[PDB]
Amino acid sequence: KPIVFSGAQPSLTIGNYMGALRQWVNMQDDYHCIYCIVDQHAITVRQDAQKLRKATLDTLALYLACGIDPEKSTIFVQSHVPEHAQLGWALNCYTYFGELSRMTQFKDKSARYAENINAGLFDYPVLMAADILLYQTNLVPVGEDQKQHLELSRDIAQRFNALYGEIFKVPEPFIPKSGARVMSLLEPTKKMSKSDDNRNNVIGLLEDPKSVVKKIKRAVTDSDEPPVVRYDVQNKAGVSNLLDILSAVTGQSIPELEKQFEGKMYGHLKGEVADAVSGMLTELQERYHRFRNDEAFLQQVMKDGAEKASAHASRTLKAVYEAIGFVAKPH
Amino acid sequence: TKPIVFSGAQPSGELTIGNYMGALRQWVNMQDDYHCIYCIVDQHAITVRQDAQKLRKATLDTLALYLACGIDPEKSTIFVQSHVPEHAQLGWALNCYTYFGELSRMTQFKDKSARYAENINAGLFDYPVLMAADILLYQTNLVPVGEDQKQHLELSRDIAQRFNALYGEIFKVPEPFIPKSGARVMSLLEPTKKMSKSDDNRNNVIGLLEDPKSVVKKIKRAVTDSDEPPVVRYDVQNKAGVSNLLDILSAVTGQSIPELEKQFEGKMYGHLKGEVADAVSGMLTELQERYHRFRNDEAFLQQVMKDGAEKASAHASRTLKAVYEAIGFVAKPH
Numbered sequence: 001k002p003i004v005f006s007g008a009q010p011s012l013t014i015g016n017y018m019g020a021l022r023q024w025v026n027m028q029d030d031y032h033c034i035y036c037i038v039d040q041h042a043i044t045v046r047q048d049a050q051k052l053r054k055a056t057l058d059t060l061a062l063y064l065a066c067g068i069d070p071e072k073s074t075i076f077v078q079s080h081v082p083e084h085a086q087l088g089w090a091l092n093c094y095t096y097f098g099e100l101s102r103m104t105q106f107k108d109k110s111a112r113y114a115e116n117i118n119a120g121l122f123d124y125p126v127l128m129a130a131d132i133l134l135y136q137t138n139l140v141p142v143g144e145d146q147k148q149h150l151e152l153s154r155d156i157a158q159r160f161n162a163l164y165g166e167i168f169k170v171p172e173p174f175i176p177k178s179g180a181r182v183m184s185l186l187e188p189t190k191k192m193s194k195s196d197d198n199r200n201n202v203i204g205l206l207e208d209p210k211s212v213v214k215k216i217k218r219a220v221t222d223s224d225e226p227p228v229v230r231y232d233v234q235n236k237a238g239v240s241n242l243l244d245i246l247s248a249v250t251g252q253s254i255p256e257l258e259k260q261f262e263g264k265m266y267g268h269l270k271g272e273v274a275d276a277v278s279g280m281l282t283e284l285q286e287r288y289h290r291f292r293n294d295e296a297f298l299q300q301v302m303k304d305g306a307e308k309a310s311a312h313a314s315r316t317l318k319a320v321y322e323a324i325g326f327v328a329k330p331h
Numbered sequence: 332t333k334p335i336v337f338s339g340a341q342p343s344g345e346l347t348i349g350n351y352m353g354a355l356r357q358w359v360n361m362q363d364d365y366h367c368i369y370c371i372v373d374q375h376a377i378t379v380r381q382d383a384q385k386l387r388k389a390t391l392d393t394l395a396l397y398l399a400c401g402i403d404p405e406k407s408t409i410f411v412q413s414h415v416p417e418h419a420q421l422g423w424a425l426n427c428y429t430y431f432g433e434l435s436r437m438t439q440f441k442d443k444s445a446r447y448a449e450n451i452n453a454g455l456f457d458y459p460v461l462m463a464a465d466i467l468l469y470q471t472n473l474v475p476v477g478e479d480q481k482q483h484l485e486l487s488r489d490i491a492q493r494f495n496a497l498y499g500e501i502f503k504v505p506e507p508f509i510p511k512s513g514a515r516v517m518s519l520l521e522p523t524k525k526m527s528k529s530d531d532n533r534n535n536v537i538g539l540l541e542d543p544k545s546v547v548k549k550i551k552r553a554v555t556d557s558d559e560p561p562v563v564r565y566d567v568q569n570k571a572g573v574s575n576l577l578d579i580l581s582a583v584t585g586q587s588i589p590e591l592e593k594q595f596e597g598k599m600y601g602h603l604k605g606e607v608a609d610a611v612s613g614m615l616t617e618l619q620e621r622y623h624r625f626r627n628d629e630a631f632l633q634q635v636m637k638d639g640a641e642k643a644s645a646h647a648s649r650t651l652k653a654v655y656e657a658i659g660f661v662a663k664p665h
């Protein structure tokens with residue numbers, strides 16, 4: 001059974017859910033899935049302390065609500081496993097400074113970067129590599145934005161294995177994609193992104209029906225006269241995106257939906273999409289609030305998951321320290 | 332409670348008289364007056380690539396030499412850095428309160444990048460942050476180091492102050508303690524660069540375990556100047572080699588430079604080298620007599636390490652838990 005590692009930032013969209021996460025929720029029996037809430041990555045951006053703690057718990061209950069089963073998968077908070085920072089430091093010594101500056105798009109020799117960017121923002125690719133390599137990870141699902149970081153982890157693993165023997169597994173990307181690419185609501189040729197400054201482009205899993213219905217009702221459609229609800233990505237991006245969102249929620253095929261909307265207006269299409277999406281989020285949010293309000297259950301999940309995570313992580317760290325040449329701590 | 336002293340050295344070679352006068356002698360002398368914690372920083376040592384067997388041996392060479400010098404495990408906490416996870420944990424957190432420009436301007440990083448251009452790694456660049464983590468974990472008041480670490484200590488002062496200005500009275504602000512002589516003992520054949528444990532050219536350095544015949548030979552070959560007549564005077568700019576010998580002799584004996592200049596009026600460099608070699612070797616007789624007994628006593632070495640990591644971890648965890656609360660991390664359940 002392959003080991004799969006995902007990091008979960010404590011700061012999710014329907015594109016994330018109906019794309020990666022929903023499919024992974026159904027593969028917890030096919031892979032040894034590990035979910036790490038990366039609160040040590042989070043502090044690379046300064047934030048109120050009390051919001052960070054809350055958002056760590058929000059992220060945990062959200063992933064449980066999405067269906068991550070802590071009896072089947074390991075889910076845990078990054079800072080609860082000291083080995084993450086321990087390996088991160090050690091791997092810094094096997095990472096070229098030049099590799100990390102390539103990641104900043106070589107903007108680190110300037111004065112603007114020197115005066116404002118903290119060393120965490122510069123060094124976090126090595127900590128991400130430590131996250132992956134601690135668990136003998138075989139598979140890391142990543143979007144396009146993380147391919148360079150994943151490649152660095154593979155390079156570090158191979159460089160270390162070449163010096164010391166096979167201590168790490170060389171991780172691979174997870175190549176197959178699921179769902180459709182959910183497109184942003186006001187620019188239907190750009191993928192919906194959790195990062196978008198225009199929040200009207202995005203549906204978050206924790207928005208209420210009312211706000212979600214407003215955004216879907218305002219989604220950009222085409223000028224075809226008469227209006228035709230028909231799938232055509234090239235010429236009808238907005239209408240096709242709406243159909244793709246509806247099909248991904250309901251499982252109805254696009255030809256079926258095209259038959260449903262024969263002779264109907266774009267407003268009736270938007271209404272149906274808004275209802276379907278709004279229905280999916282209510283189920284999710286109902287489960288979310290049950291988990292989130294049970295502080296003791298959430299505490300028991302984090303304790304169990306960090307104990308599971310620690311057992312594997314310490315084995316790797318002991319082998320790294322032995323290979324490096326450290327004197328073992330007496331026990 | 333006493334004020335707290337923390338200092339560390341890398342397991343990267345045999346300690347030199349430079350390490351002794353810059354740092355180690357003060358470590359020993361502070362052990363009654365303060366609460367002293369001393370560390371063999373193996374996580375810092377791997378920023379420069381070493382053979383695994385070499386690094387393992389060097390860690391115990393360093394530990395046994397601390398002890399031989401009079402670091403007393405019944406007065407001080409002695410431990411190996413990697414045995415205490417909190418150092419790496421606080422090291423990562425402090426990365427986020429350290430600006431990139433503060434590290435890129437560091438003189439050590441530039442110097443070591445030149446020496447090891449084939450291994451310019453991120454640990455080498457990040458070195459000062461992990462050092463700040465080492466110091467601030469223990470509520471440290473005083474850090475005895477040589478002059479070369481002054482810039483790194485200033486970053487430690489800034490990091491503590493910057494962190495405390497956000498989150499409260501979490502860290503003590505540490506103060507350097509650099510001595511007035513022997514703070515920067517220079518290399519014997521290249522007197523414009525400091526003496527360094529890790530120097531490939533061993534004729535630049537005097538190891539603390541070198542016998543009197545080795546000491547005289549290295550001091551006799553130390554670079555001087557072309558002055559005719561030779562003059563024993565302190566002048567770094569024009570007389571770097573002779574000045575380095577005067578600094579060393581001042582550090583061994585405690586005589587001031589002007590007292591040494593009067594003492595050597597009309598004399599020659601061969602006489603100065605005679606005095607330096609004898610003073611140096613006299614300074615090493617006691618530690619050399621005990622080092623092998625320390626080094627071959629595996630059980631004693633293990634016990635010192637076990638006890639030191641346990642004490643150091645007790646104190647370090649309390650600081651790190653306070654840090655993780657301030658920053659906003661969910662605490663790890665009991």
Ligand SMILES: Nc1ncnc2c1ncn2[C@@H]1O[C@H](COP(=O)(O)OP(=O)(O)OP(=O)(O)O)[C@@H](O)[C@H]1O
Nearest residue numbers: 015016019020142143180181182191192193194195
């Ligand atoms: N709109 C979307 N449609 C389909 N898949 C998506 C969408 N947004 C994210 N994903 C997928 O979800 C996973 C999470 O990746 P990631 O967090 O980088 O996505 P994102 O939300 O677009 O991120 P960002 O906003 O930072 O660019 C990836 O597999 C990615 O391809």
Ligand SMILES: Nc1ncnc2c1ncn2[C@@H]1O[C@H](COP(=O)(O)OP(=O)(O)OP(=O)(O)O)[C@@H](O)[C@H]1O
Nearest residue numbers: 340341349353354476477514515516526527528529
């Ligand atoms: N030439 C020197 N003169 C005085 N103090 C020194 C000298 N070199 C190092 N020190 C001091 O010795 C202590 C330990 O430093 P460290 O372990 O880095 O030794 P080193 O000889 O500089 O080795 P390396 O070349 O591997 O850095 C520090 O407090 C440092 O300031």
Ligand SMILES: C[C@H]1c2c[nH]c3cccc(c23)S[C@H]1C(=O)O
Nearest residue numbers: 005006007008009038128131146
């Ligand atoms: C959360 C981040 C992260 C930290 N450690 C890991 C390990 C694997 C994948 C990722 C990460 S994905 C990345 C992201 O920015 O999405």
Ligand SMILES: C[C@H]1c2c[nH]c3cccc(c23)S[C@H]1C(=O)O
Nearest residue numbers: 338339340341372375462465480
């Ligand atoms: C050994 C290094 C180190 C790591 N942690 C500490 C703490 C105090 C002083 C020093 C150090 S001195 C410094 C050096 O490179 O000289």
Ligand SMILES: [Mg+2]
Nearest residue numbers: 142143144145
């Ligand atoms: Mg993406």
Ligand SMILES: [Mg+2]
Nearest residue numbers: 341479527528
């Ligand atoms: Mg040094």
